[PDB]
Design a protein around this ligand. Sequence first.
Ligand SMILES: CCCCCCCCCCCCCCCCCC(=O)OC[C@H](COP(=O)([O-])OCC(O)COP(=O)([O-])OC[C@@H](COC(=O)CCCCCCCCCCCCCCCCC)OC(=O)CCCCCCCCCCCCCCCCC)OC(=O)CCCCCCCCCCCCCCCCC
Ligand SMILES: CCCCCCCCCCCCCCCCC[C@@H](O)O[C@H](CO[C@H](O)CCCCCCCCCCCCCCC)COP(=O)(O)OCC[N+](C)(C)C
Ligand SMILES: CCCCCCCCCCCCCCCCC[C@@H](O)O[C@H](CO[C@H](O)CCCCCCCCCCCCCCC)COP(=O)(O)OCC[N+](C)(C)C
Ligand SMILES: CCCCCCCCCCCCCCCCC[C@@H](O)O[C@H](CO[C@H](O)CCCCCCCCCCCCCCC)COP(=O)(O)OCC[N+](C)(C)C
Ligand SMILES: CCCCCCCC/C=C\CCCCCCCC(=O)O[C@H](COC(=O)CCCCCCC/C=C/CCCCCCCC)COP(=O)(O)OCCN
Ligand SMILES: Nc1ncnc2c1ncn2[C@@H]1O[C@H](COP(=O)(O)OP(=O)(O)O)[C@@H](O)[C@H]1O
Lengths: 320, 98, 104, 49, 347, 459, 55, 56, 44, 121
Amino acid sequence: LQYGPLAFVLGERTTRKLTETSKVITVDGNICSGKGRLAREIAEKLGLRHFPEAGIHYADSTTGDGKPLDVQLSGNCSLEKFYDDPKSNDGNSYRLQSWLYASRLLQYADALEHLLSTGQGVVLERSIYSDFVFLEAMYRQGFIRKQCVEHYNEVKKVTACEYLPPHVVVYVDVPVPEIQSRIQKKGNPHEMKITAAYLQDIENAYKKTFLPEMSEKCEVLQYSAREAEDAEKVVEDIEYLKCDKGPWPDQDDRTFHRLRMLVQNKLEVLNYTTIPVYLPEITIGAHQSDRVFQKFTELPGRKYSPGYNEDVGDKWIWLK
Amino acid sequence: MPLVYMNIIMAFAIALAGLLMYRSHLMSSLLCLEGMMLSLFIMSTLIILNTHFTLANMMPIILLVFAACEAALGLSLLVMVSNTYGTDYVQNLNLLQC
Amino acid sequence: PTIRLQEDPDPEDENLYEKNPDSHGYDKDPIVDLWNMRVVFFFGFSIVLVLGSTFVAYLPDYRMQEWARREAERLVKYREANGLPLMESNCFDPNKIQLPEDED
Amino acid sequence: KFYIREPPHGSPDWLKVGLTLGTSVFLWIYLIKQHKEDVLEYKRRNGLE
Amino acid sequence: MNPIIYTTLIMTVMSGTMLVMISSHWLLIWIGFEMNLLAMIPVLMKNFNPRATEAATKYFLTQATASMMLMMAIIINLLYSGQWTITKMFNPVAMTMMTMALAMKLGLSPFHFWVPEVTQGISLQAGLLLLTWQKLAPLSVLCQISQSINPNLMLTMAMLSILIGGWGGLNQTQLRKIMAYSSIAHMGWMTAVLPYNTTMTILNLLIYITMTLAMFMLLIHSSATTTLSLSHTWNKMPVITSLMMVTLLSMGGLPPLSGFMPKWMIIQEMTKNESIIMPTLMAMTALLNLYFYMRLAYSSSLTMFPSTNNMKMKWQFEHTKQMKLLPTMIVLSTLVLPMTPALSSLN
Amino acid sequence: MLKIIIPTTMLLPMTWMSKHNMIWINATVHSLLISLISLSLLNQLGENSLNFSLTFFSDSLSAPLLVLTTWLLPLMLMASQSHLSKETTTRKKLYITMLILLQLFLIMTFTATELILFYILFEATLVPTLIIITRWGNQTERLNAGLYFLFYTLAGSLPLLVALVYIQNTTGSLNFLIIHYWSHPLSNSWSNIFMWLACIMAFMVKMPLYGLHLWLPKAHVEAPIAGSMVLAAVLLKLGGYGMMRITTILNPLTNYMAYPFLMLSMWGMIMTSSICLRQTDLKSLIAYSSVSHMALVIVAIMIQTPWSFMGATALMIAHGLTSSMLFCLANTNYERVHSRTMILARGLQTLLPLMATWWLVASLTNLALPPSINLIGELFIITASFSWSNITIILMGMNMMITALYSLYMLITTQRGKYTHHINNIKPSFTRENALMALHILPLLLLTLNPKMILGPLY
Amino acid sequence: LLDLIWLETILPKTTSFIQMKMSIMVSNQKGLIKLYFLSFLITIMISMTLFNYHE
Amino acid sequence: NVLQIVRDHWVHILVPVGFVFGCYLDRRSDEKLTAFRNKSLLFKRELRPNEEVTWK
Amino acid sequence: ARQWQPDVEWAEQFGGAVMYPTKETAHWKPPPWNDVDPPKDTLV
Amino acid sequence: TMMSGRPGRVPLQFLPNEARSLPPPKLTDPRLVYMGFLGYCSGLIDNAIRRRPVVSAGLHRQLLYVTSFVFFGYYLLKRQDYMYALRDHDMFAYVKSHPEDFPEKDKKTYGEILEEFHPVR
Ligand SMILES: CCCCCCCCCCCCCCCCCC(=O)OC[C@H](COP(=O)([O-])OCC(O)COP(=O)([O-])OC[C@@H](COC(=O)CCCCCCCCCCCCCCCCC)OC(=O)CCCCCCCCCCCCCCCCC)OC(=O)CCCCCCCCCCCCCCCCC
Ligand SMILES: CCCCCCCCCCCCCCCCC[C@@H](O)O[C@H](CO[C@H](O)CCCCCCCCCCCCCCC)COP(=O)(O)OCC[N+](C)(C)C
Ligand SMILES: CCCCCCCCCCCCCCCCC[C@@H](O)O[C@H](CO[C@H](O)CCCCCCCCCCCCCCC)COP(=O)(O)OCC[N+](C)(C)C
Ligand SMILES: CCCCCCCCCCCCCCCCC[C@@H](O)O[C@H](CO[C@H](O)CCCCCCCCCCCCCCC)COP(=O)(O)OCC[N+](C)(C)C
Ligand SMILES: CCCCCCCC/C=C\CCCCCCCC(=O)O[C@H](COC(=O)CCCCCCC/C=C/CCCCCCCC)COP(=O)(O)OCCN
Ligand SMILES: Nc1ncnc2c1ncn2[C@@H]1O[C@H](COP(=O)(O)OP(=O)(O)O)[C@@H](O)[C@H]1O
């Protein structure tokens, strides 16, 4: 039985599967920080489920086969081109920003669905609550316009208000010269073109806005570059927290039922991402839309429902 | 038709006109609604008492019961309106204009 | 962006005579093209046109125009042999008509 | 292939198919029997056969 | 809201409507109306926001005034004849009061003002309920006392409703207000034939209920509440937009679609009496409803509007919950005209 | 007559189940077979109709129209399969479905034995045409053209429905046979005058009458080639069929009620014919010529003589064929140069000789060259009008002088002169286009060989 | 003068203008229940005076 | 070879089958209008000693 | 060469508060994307 | 209105006993075939909406659609025929019981009736 009103009237309640160790955690940091490894260590030590940071092709991994699709069919944006030409006149910067925000929203919905269906906790490498800093980094450097900022703000206001903030916010603080040195030592040619002002803007928006905002409703555990390697210390710091300030203690069975109905039905989650606001950077013409949609339909397992595609090995179709 | 029936009908008409006119407060409109209920109850009671309809005597009581429901309903809505605006002014209820 | 949409450019016309010098103007695939031409010509010019015109030209005279001619010849012969006016101005026999007795 | 197991099973739901076919067959048999009964009843009333 | 409480409220609304239908007593019909309104008010407020509270308050005030007038009409009828049975309504003043109260409950012009705002102020499910199930009881009461319907008042209100719905629908961009104005026009069409034949009224009611259910279920499937938000559906659900266009054409009244049958039968029934001018005016006025239906069809199905990039992600996700009877409702809303004589099973 | 109706409803699923690259072949072949089958309806009786069943019947007026429709469908498919090459298979099947539904509705319309069913199918024909025009048109004027086409028709047709139901209530039946046998004169009353107007105005709009014709130039120009063909060839003749079916009950009121329309039909005949002299768009020129010819048909129907009816039937058939051929010829140049301006592409006889002779024969047929059926119908109508009034010839004569004046003019503008220099994308004419022109033009000559088949029941 | 100006003016353009004006007049309401219930009172009084009198 | 070509061109029999069905339905329809068969004042004819109906 | 389809300029005429903008309703604003007006920060 | 109140009518029968004296509709009735076609169309639309192969996705559910539509249509046709038979029976009885309101007029031949002639010219 798929979860719904019928499964709620009889039997299934979610407050009987929350076991005080759920503690939705998002690990946060500037570019080229050890936040990913720290998140993985925290997840494998606390017994939670780790979510790798949502990229351009995150949605492709959760639908059909996990293999990513073409950039023209999903995303229509690349990070390498943003690093090469951040001021390109085709609108790649804000298109990438909006696609990344939608991917993060989808990942947050999936994490919340897993948490409310199994009771197991989740660890995230970023969230929709901290994506905006990158947006600000594009605005202060002149990469995007003010109308793009307004559209982002409208979408965030109509989307993120329906979910619960994470219990614990973990921040890995690494100074700008150190992350610049790490980028130099990394080896990716495209990342070498990141100016210091971009990272400084990210850090400024991160310290001045994100952390103060999440302080009033989440447990914020700031760290340093040297404190990140010893993940056992971070884990035992998490085990001795008091999650008493957020809206989580004020959640009943009915609110949890509404949230669980919302986190599934990913179409409902993504509804307000495609509002009819005609920004030139993200608006697509009728001919291009039709061509790309027809190309997407021609994919091996995308013409029909996930159980009615004969050309991927689905048998007994006529009896379903 | 006696004069008392005419007075009761005039009272009902006055209460209906008072409801149809809105000044500022929703409370006054609810008061007019309860006044219409009272006038209907009085008219029904007089009619049922004049013509000795014994089994009809309970039906005004039922009327009063549903009156409370309406009043209750209105009060609930009024509270929400106040919680949205701090006043029960009908001028604030204009969001559905556009 | 100094533009308004992410729109595909208008493609140029594809000349059918380029990849197929004998293209018949029916389809890009030469085999389906040739068979479309053949079926159009056979069922349009050969079957419907000529055979249908032959069928129309030899339709039986359900309109009864030679019958009317023969009847007219017989009637004319009879009436001329009996010295009759060959046609009466009254389509129906006046004896079977009851006019109003008076109009005054 | 599919990353998820496609909740609607790759083999058809034998229970659902079973009772769907069963109710279709039952409806058809009931309709046939009803038609025969009304034919006989109408013939009996009107004195035809 | 708790699912059990929501089910109880919906069942209470349905039970109030059933009580109105199955009661031979005026007091019991009034009690059914009261129960219907009492249980219906929270349903409009299931999703809490200032607009829902606005719609609930306006609906409650309108229905309370209509109930007051209905009870006064019942009391006057009792005064002039000691009868409690829903019958010929021996008094004309009480009969006029009942006609006006029921017209205000239905939303007939000039009491239509509440319909566009309430429908816009509530969700699509609440709008579906309001525009489909809430019209049964007042229409049933009107049918039961059709012998004493004053033809002048009822026909004037019906013509006003048709004209006002047709004119108001032209100016609307939001879909809920368009549906409300179409509801007002169809209410006028239904009530115009009421004094002559209630079977035609029931047939029009059934055809409208089918079409409205199909329309609202399509608008819920494609989560669109505005014209431009519906312009994005072709890039995700072309079949849904095509079915929506066919359903809109059916509501327009074009043959051989289902929507032509009710107006055709009503025109025939009216022309069985003398009644020549009024059906002609009704048709030339329903032309406006067809016009804004066609405008919606242009914006939604017959042209391809620009889309957004994020829609690509929506391409990878199917619908979680599918509404039942949507294909059946679409089929009944389009391909039913050849079965027109079956209306003889309605009297 | 279900032996013709059912094969179209079988064209539907065969098209929807054919493979992607075989839809056009199957559709064309089976439509040609259906037209061959329907050709058997031309064996008409001399006194009464062919009463097949209680719902369908055929006489010598509806049979040529049915044959014309069944023959026109394959031509529409042939011309449509060129500009829909890049279209997806589903939408190509949808277009073919629209055409098939239009043909089926027309077939049922031309043989409905009672007036309400005829009206229902007559309005049902509107939906496929509107969808075609507003979905597969090229310019942004297609929306307004579709709106005009829909509302002009409906505004005149709803009062027709009211009048029809009133007539059925008064007399008890609307079957054409019972209506004709039980016909009674109409009194000189205001109620009878408005009943006449309600019965006549729908078909006046569908002709269209001069004054209510503004929808036709919009609809015929913005529509795709198949839509233009079906509009000019068949859909304009629905009004004529309805007029010559319903005028039996309108007598003797018509004797004094046709006076305005006749004037609008005659003077307008001149006016539209003059407009073609100053038209910078080829499709608009063809549309206005269609308007003038249909006004002549209106005159023929209104004056109501046997010669008038024979001429009207002949002119309807001839104009349908001629307008279809002219629209196809214009569309060939449009696909060549992607513009509808007449003086853009000039001197095409040098580069397209066979297409030039197709243009010449189409223009010669348009201006009523003897002994074509165009001239037969026009001359019969002219003789009937001269019997009606000896002054009408003047106007008639004027029209003739204007008609050729623009016809050859178009032939001179597009085909003669010198070629435009910068245009270098004029490819040789394809076999499909030449076959389409031949299949348009050969039936005209074969019909003037045996013209009694298109002279109507009055023959 | 005739086709593009006056024939357009009489039938379709006048109809469109009148329908647009009537739509603007009808639809544009202030959204306040005070005016709506004032109109309801006026309608009730008119119906009582006009239709009810002529029984 | 028969299987694939049949599964490819089975759609070419729909129209001939439709025409045959239409002819059969026309026969069934016009066999219901025999209320005046051999009863016309113009075609009342004596039945031959071997036939049973003037027309089918 | 290709079929004309609506653009942003064409679509923006269906994105207003009401059709046929006038002087009185020029200052009307379309309702929020989700039908949730911002909470009025009423002073307590 | 007209048929709502009739003597000896059970309220919610939907099929009175006296309806069994009428010939039942044939199973090959064209209206029943149309109802089956409606069921098939409903099944096809169900397949198309849920993004499944329209022609061949679910055969059992399409069969259920068709049989449900046919099943409902059979009783719908029975009730329709019964109501039309009732209408004709009532009309004939009313005509028979009121001879003065439906008198048989004198038969006149076209040779006696004088119809005015309107020439066309
Ligand atoms: C009167 C006479 C009879 C007529 C009756 C009425 C018409 C017929 C009934 C109509 C209802 C039935 C089907 C409706 C649901 C189907 C939906 C659909 O899309 O079909 C896809 C489907 C193909 O899709 P697929 O194979 O799954 O894979 C491709 C993907 O789906 C690809 O999917 P996609 O996502 O890419 O598709 C996108 C596309 C999809 O959009 C659509 O396809 C539109 C869907 C139609 C809307 C239906 C609305 C309700 C019906 C009302 C009809 C009104 C009729 C009155 C006239 C007015 C016309 C509007 O949308 C667009 O591209 C936008 C284009 C805009 C066009 C606007 C016009 C649309 C409305 C026109 C409706 C007219 C009727 C069409 C009937 C056939 C349509 C399939 O089509 C079919 O295969 C079904 C056709 C019928 C099957 C018959 C086969 C049975 C066996 C054959 C043999 C017969 C007996 C043999 C025995 C003999 C002895 C040997
Ligand atoms: C490219 C090279 C060009 C130059 C070379 C030309 C080669 C030689 C051609 C020149 C010869 C000219 C022909 C001379 C006339 C002879 C034919 C004539 O005798 O046949 C006519 C017959 O013509 C046909 O009837 C024409 C049929 C009409 C067309 C059929 C329709 C085909 C379907 C196409 C769709 C049409 C849709 C439009 C609505 C109908 C006469 O009719 P009729 O005297 O009585 O019947 C004679 C038989 N009888 C005596 C037993 C009665
Ligand atoms: C753009 C093109 C649109 C189509 C145009 C169609 C035209 C339709 C007009 C139909 C003509 C006949 C209508 C009236 C019949 C008689 C004409 C009128 O002069 O009547 C006279 C009567 O004198 C007065 O004129 C009476 C009528 C006065 C009112 C009519 C004026 C309307 C103004 C014109 C408006 C333009 C029409 C289009 C409107 C949208 C005749 O005197 P009389 O012999 O004793 O009466 C004969 C009729 N009876 C026997 C039934 C009584
Ligand atoms: C587009 C079509 C919409 C149709 C709406 C839904 C279709 C399914 C209908 C559901 C069938 C069950 C309903 C009732 C069955 C058993 C109950 C039985 O007792 O009902 C009796 C009789 O059943 C119903 O009355 C008739 C229901 C039949 C509905 C079908 C008619 C549709 C109109 C024609 C359009 C063509 C549709 C073709 C099929 C889709 C009631 O008798 P009565 O107490 O005396 O009526 C009181 C009200 N009156 C007197 C004023 C009428
Ligand atoms: C593209 C635009 C075309 C517009 C065409 C629309 C107008 C068509 C002409 C008017 C049609 C309406 C006529 C009504 C239907 C006919 C029914 C009838 O004639 O019955 C008469 C009823 O006649 C009427 O009632 C007709 C009243 C007309 C009301 C509608 C007015 C519409 C506009 C009228 C003026 C314009 C007409 C011509 C316009 C031409 C288009 C420009 C007899 O009924 P009884 O009452 O029983 O009388 C006998 C017992 N004493
Ligand atoms: N909202 C965003 N906007 C632009 N770029 C982003 C955004 N989110 C992530 N990125 C890019 O994704 C890249 C990888 O992120 P990061 O976590 O810092 O590296 P790593 O995975 O090695 O730890 C970075 O170069 C970062 O710039």
